[PDB]
Design a binder for this molecule. Structure first.
Ligand SMILES: *[C@@H]1O[C@H](CO)[C@@H](O[C@@H]2O[C@H](CO)[C@@H](O)[C@H](O)[C@H]2NC(C)=O)[C@H](O)[C@H]1NC(C)=O
Ligand SMILES: *[C@@H]1O[C@H](CO)[C@@H](O[C@@H]2O[C@H](CO)[C@@H](O)[C@H](O)[C@H]2NC(C)=O)[C@H](O)[C@H]1NC(C)=O
Ligand SMILES: *[C@@H]1O[C@H](CO)[C@@H](O[C@@H]2O[C@H](CO)[C@@H](O)[C@H](O)[C@H]2NC(C)=O)[C@H](O)[C@H]1NC(C)=O
Ligand SMILES: *[C@@H]1O[C@H](CO)[C@@H](O[C@@H]2O[C@H](CO)[C@@H](O)[C@H](O)[C@H]2NC(C)=O)[C@H](O)[C@H]1NC(C)=O
Ligand SMILES: *[C@@H]1O[C@H](CO)[C@@H](O)[C@H](O)[C@H]1NC(C)=O
Ligand SMILES: *[C@@H]1O[C@H](CO)[C@@H](O)[C@H](O)[C@H]1NC(C)=O
Ligand SMILES: *[C@@H]1O[C@H](CO)[C@@H](O)[C@H](O)[C@H]1NC(C)=O
Ligand SMILES: *[C@@H]1O[C@H](CO)[C@@H](O)[C@H](O)[C@H]1NC(C)=O
Ligand SMILES: *[C@@H]1O[C@H](CO)[C@@H](O)[C@H](O)[C@H]1NC(C)=O
Ligand SMILES: *[C@@H]1O[C@H](CO)[C@@H](O)[C@H](O)[C@H]1NC(C)=O
Ligand SMILES: *[C@@H]1O[C@H](CO)[C@@H](O)[C@H](O)[C@H]1NC(C)=O
Ligand SMILES: *[C@@H]1O[C@H](CO)[C@@H](O)[C@H](O)[C@H]1NC(C)=O
Lengths: 283, 98, 320, 46, 49, 49, 99
């Protein structure tokens, strides 16, 4: 075993030696030589989180210790602990005691901003001006007051037309798996051994087929809603309103608007749906 | 701002990559290649030696299928919301706030 | 001779001391391995051998402990540094290595032989031959021999203005001995420090002797005065080797472009656990910490009377 | 003597990002807005 | 148990996905409150009367 | 040791699966609450009940 | 193992012997005989789907081979890629290549 031994008050019976808890583990023990009772508890541990502004900006980092006091558990011991190579003593960079734990490497200021990197319990950190890592308390918003009165009202005179976008996912990639090749690659004996398990692969294929059909049904419900295919007249004058950036252009081989092209080009930074690939991939 | 559509692709790619990387797991066996086990050892213990790998890979497949089933429900919810928004905003005028 | 002691210097190891761990070719993959490696930004000894006191021999060749491995390197110009003899106790009663570099033969010998006070070699050929064999008198028991091409293919300094940067990693494990090397010229030498550049160390030979090695010694190749015995200027470095976890990055061709340590600073192991060299802004969870035990406690009851085991076994008659 | 038993087996709880006071402030702001403005503050300036 | 940690390393990546799922759950927990309550960009005050 | 390791991994996987399943319905309830807050407090709704 | 051996352009170093891929699969090998770098690529395969109009009406069916180009794997190959006796007629219809 390994733990911290202290005195205990559990009055053992004459024949009882060990002790257990609800956690089905040993918790108390009697010394083999002297008739003393001792309790077993593991020594301190915890978790470590690293806060960084990103390698593209700077290499400075801030280290957060979770659920420990700055001084009660000073992981700053001579040297050899877990993650031994770090020292991060940094008494110069003031250690800030947060609700989550001890934050070492950041400076605490009497300010308020938006939350850039969430730490916990209303404390956020950001890389701000020379340049260093700071910690503060997030600000809910700008203060305001409304001039309420028994007889007072405000009426607008001007209007603003606003256009905002909204993106919603619809479907995901349809995939299928093969049991025999994935589990036992090129082994008849392994397949024969698998045969003794019965059917643990009908369920997987059934679930994946259901998912694929579900995806197709989702797309059909979302888009297929009109029974006719209308066309706009060749003249594109609508009361002075200009719709040239969303109506399709017949000139392009693919009947897609400019904004649709921008969306496709933006999303194509990652396209794993290479259906066009075939068995010709033997290069 | 197209993070919602990027997250789906990223999650699917990462899950598939983890599934294909899982094949290197020893699962307590001496080696991760079936052919080596067959060539170097007789059947009497090769049966259990390959059985351990069978159990590990079956568990991995089950975990992957469960994750896909869980994600399908969220995708369905998003699709239903999108269909409702299409029907209530594009085809008419909505008095609901926000 | 009656040379005086020289206080050792120190230098920053920078990002050097990485070799190919296995024979397998891998391309366009970020493979992580656990093996013996040189920590980044580590102190390295700066033994410097030169004509001391303008004509006094300097014996800057202590019996350095081998421990777990070395990172012998040099900025040598001409062929002056040779010999990497080893010895557990360094006497005639202990098996030892001998790596000479005479002409074009390594002549690897594993024999028991007496060691000179200050063994040395003659870079110039004793004309007429070379008693270069002054390092020892004779070898009475020989076990292993090996002759092949010299361990260095570096071209001679020629006109000059460029010197060699021979690097060697010696590792002994499970009765095996492996040697890795890589050479490259040097541009500027004003501060006399290892340049900040990445190098991959390919294997060159495998040696299967299970010799026990605890101390390391090096030799010099100086012929005579050109009073006493004198030579040119040279410098070599020694770096001890300790276990570490590294993350390697292969290229399309299959050569290691760069690597990152997984224990240096929190950013390093954050990159390690993200399996990428680029980290975006955010907060990440990397590992955990605890306190290791400091003492061992063994408490048993104290009784001394032996059990009557002989009665049970050494009995004249056994029951039915 | 219940949270420590779980903590000794690596089972922790992380604190929420927003405390109770900020939620109370949001609720008070919404109440004041809907009292002194009506529904106009939901689609522009109050 | 130092040797049990070495033995567990032979089971591949059975701890990365668990941690990722838990972190995703925590982030979604924060996002729920952020979406429900943070609906106004101004902090109004009631008049003293 | 392998038997115990497999058993404990199974327990952890079951726990994670149940947590995700619960998080799904919590997300649904949070979305409903946000919609109700945006429609009933910030305006007047003609939807019955 | 089983695979299709083809010429390779891998830049093997003299000490390197065995190649690999992203996921622990040996896609290259060095000849124990006269030196030659070689690739390994697993042999062709795919899934099978059966299309029917209903047992009630007719018995004629159509077979769709999933994710394989028609040219290199037709039904006229004598190799009988599993399902030996299970052969649709060579030109029962003009074979159609779909995505
Ligand atoms: C708006 O009217 C109210 C009520 O008339 C005023 O509040 C006080 O109400 C009490 C009880 O009804 C009266 O006895 C007081 O006379 C009221 N105050 C005053 C100043 O008359 C409130 O003050 C009024 N506010 C304004 C801005 O006119
Ligand atoms: C009401 O507000 C709108 C705000 O856009 C006014 O439109 C602007 O008026 C100013 C007056 O100097 C012009 O300089 C701007 O060019 C106008 N905007 C545009 C887009 O042209 C509008 O005039 C105001 N009054 C009325 C009666 O609508
Ligand atoms: C509708 O908007 C489009 C936006 O592209 C207008 O097309 C632009 O017109 C300007 C006129 O000065 C040209 O300089 C641009 O090169 C045009 N852009 C493209 C992509 O062709 C179009 O003129 C607008 N039509 C109306 C009736 O307002
Ligand atoms: C990889 O190997 C190639 C071939 O030996 C090296 O040489 C150049 O590679 C590039 C492709 O990156 C070709 O366009 C050039 O034609 C090759 N030759 C020359 C003289 O440049 C290449 O340097 C190696 N390293 C990398 C990173 O590609
Ligand atoms: C161990 O020895 C000491 C000294 O002889 C004695 O006092 C003690 O009782 C012994 N232990 C036990 C369990 O009797
Ligand atoms: C504000 O700054 C002062 C130093 O000027 C410091 O003493 C004080 O603690 C800060 N406020 C808080 C809440 O920490
Ligand atoms: C040993 O050291 C002495 C110096 O006291 C030196 O004169 C002698 O030459 C050395 N031994 C040999 C064999 O050179
Ligand atoms: C060689 O000399 C060593 C050292 O004296 C001795 O241990 C060994 O037995 C000798 N070998 C012979 C004489 O074959
Ligand atoms: C180096 O010395 C060995 C000692 O026997 C000899 O056999 C070898 O030929 C020498 N190398 C030369 C002369 O190139
Ligand atoms: C035997 O192997 C060698 C090795 O390269 C090769 O050159 C030779 O052609 C092979 N066959 C014969 C008959 O030697
Ligand atoms: C389908 O089969 C049933 C029973 O086999 C039969 O009664 C029915 O008429 C069939 N349907 C058609 C369209 O023929
Ligand atoms: C199928 O193979 C033929 C011949 O190799 C080729 O011409 C054709 O383009 C291929 N079809 C596809 C879809 O790759």
């Amino acid at each position: 075993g390994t733990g911290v031994l202290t005195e205990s008050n559990k009055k053992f019976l004459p024949f009882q030696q060990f002790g257990r808890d609800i956690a089905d583990t040993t918790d108390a023990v009697r010394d083999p030589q002297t008739l003393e009772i001792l309790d077993i508890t593991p020594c301190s541990f915890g978790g470590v989180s690293v806060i960084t502004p990103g390698t593209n900006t700077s290499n400075q980092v801030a280290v957060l210790y979770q659920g420990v006091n700055c001084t009660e558990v000073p992981v700053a011991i001579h040297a050899d602990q877990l993650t031994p190579t770090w020292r991060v003593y940094s008494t110069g960079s003031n250690v800030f005691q947060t609700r989550a734990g001890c934050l070492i490497g950041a400076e605490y200021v009497n300010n308020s901003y938006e939350c850039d990197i969430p730490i916990g319990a209303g404390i956020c950190a950001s890389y701000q001006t020379s340049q260093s890592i700071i910690a503060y308390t997030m600000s809910l918003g700008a203060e305001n007051s409304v001039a309420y009165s028994n007889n007072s009202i405000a009426i607008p005179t001007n209007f603003t037309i606003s256009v905002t976008t909204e993106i919603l996912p619809v479907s995901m990639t349809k995939t299928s798996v093969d049991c025999t090749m994935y589990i036992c690659g090129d082994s008849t004996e392994c397949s024969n051994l698998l045969l003794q398990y019965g059917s643990f692969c009908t369920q997987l294929k059934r679930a994946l087929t259901g998912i694929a059909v579900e995806q197709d049904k989702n797309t059909q419900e979302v888009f297929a809603q009109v029974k006719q295919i209308y066309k706009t007249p060749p003249i594109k004058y609508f009361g002075g309103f200009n719709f040239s950036q969303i109506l399709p252009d017949p000139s392009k081989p693919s009947k897609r608007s400019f904004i649709e092209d921008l969306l496709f080009n933006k999303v194509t930074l990652a396209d794993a749906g290479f259906i066009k690939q075939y068995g010709d991939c033997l290069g | 701002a197209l993070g919602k559509l990027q997250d789906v692709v990223n999650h699917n790619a990462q899950a598939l990559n983890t599934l294909v990387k899982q094949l290197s797991s020893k699962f307590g066996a001496i080696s991760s290649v079936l052919n080596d086990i067959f060539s170097r050892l007789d059947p009497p213990e090769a049966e259990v030696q390959i059985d351990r790998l069978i159990t590990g890979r079956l568990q991995s497949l089950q975990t992957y299928v469960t994750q896909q089933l869980i994600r399908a429900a969220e995708i369905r919810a998003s699709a239903n919301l999108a269909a409702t928004k299409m029907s209530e905003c594009v085809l008419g005028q909505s008095k609901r706030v926000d | 001779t009656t040379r005086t002691q020289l206080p050792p210097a120190y230098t920053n190891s920078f990002t050097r001391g990485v070799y190919y761990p296995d024979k397998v070719f891998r391309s366009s993959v970020l493979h992580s391995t656990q093996d013996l490696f040189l920590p980044f930004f580590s102190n390295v000894t700066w033994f410097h051998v030169i004509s001391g006191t303008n004509g006094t021999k300097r014996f800057d060749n202590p019996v350095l402990p081998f421990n777990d491995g070395v990172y012998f390197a040099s900025i040598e110009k001409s062929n002056i540094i040779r010999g990497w003899i080893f010895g557990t106790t360094l006497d005639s009663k202990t098996q030892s290595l001998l790596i000479v570099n005479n002409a074009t033969n390594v002549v690897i010998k594993v024999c028991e032989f007496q060691f000179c006070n200050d063994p040395f070699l003659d870079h110039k050929n004793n004309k007429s031959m070379e008693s270069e064999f002054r390092v020892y008198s004779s070898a009475n028991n020989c076990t292993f021999e090996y002759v092949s091409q010299p361990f260095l293919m570096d071209l001679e300094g020629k006109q000059g203005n460029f010197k060699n940067l021979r690097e060697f990693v010696f590792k002994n494990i499970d009765g095996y001995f492996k040697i890795y090397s890589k050479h490259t010229p040097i541009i500027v030498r004003e501060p006399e420090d290892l340049p900040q550049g990445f190098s991959a160390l390919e294997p060159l030979v495998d040696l299967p002797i299970g010799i026990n090695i605890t101390r390391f010694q090096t030799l010099l190749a100086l012929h005579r005065s050109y009073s006493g015995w004198t030579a040119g200027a040279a410098a070599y470095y020694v770096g001890y080797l300790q276990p570490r976890t590294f993350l390697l990055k292969y290229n399309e061709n299959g050569t290691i472009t760069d690597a990152v340590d997984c224990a240096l600073d929190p950013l390093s192991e954050t990159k390690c656990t993200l399996k990428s060299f680029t980290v975006e802004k955010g907060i990440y969870q990397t590992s955990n910490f605890r306190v290791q035990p400091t003492e061992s406690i063994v408490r048993f009851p104290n009784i001394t009377n032996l059990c009557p085991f002989d009665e049970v076994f050494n009995a004249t008659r056994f029951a039915s | 003597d219940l949270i420590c038993a779980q903590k000794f087996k690596g089972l922790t709880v992380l604190p929420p990002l927003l405390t109770d006071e900020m939620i109370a402030q949001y609720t008070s702001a919404l109440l004041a807005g809907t009292i002194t403005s009506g529904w106009t503050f939901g689609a522009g300036a109050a």
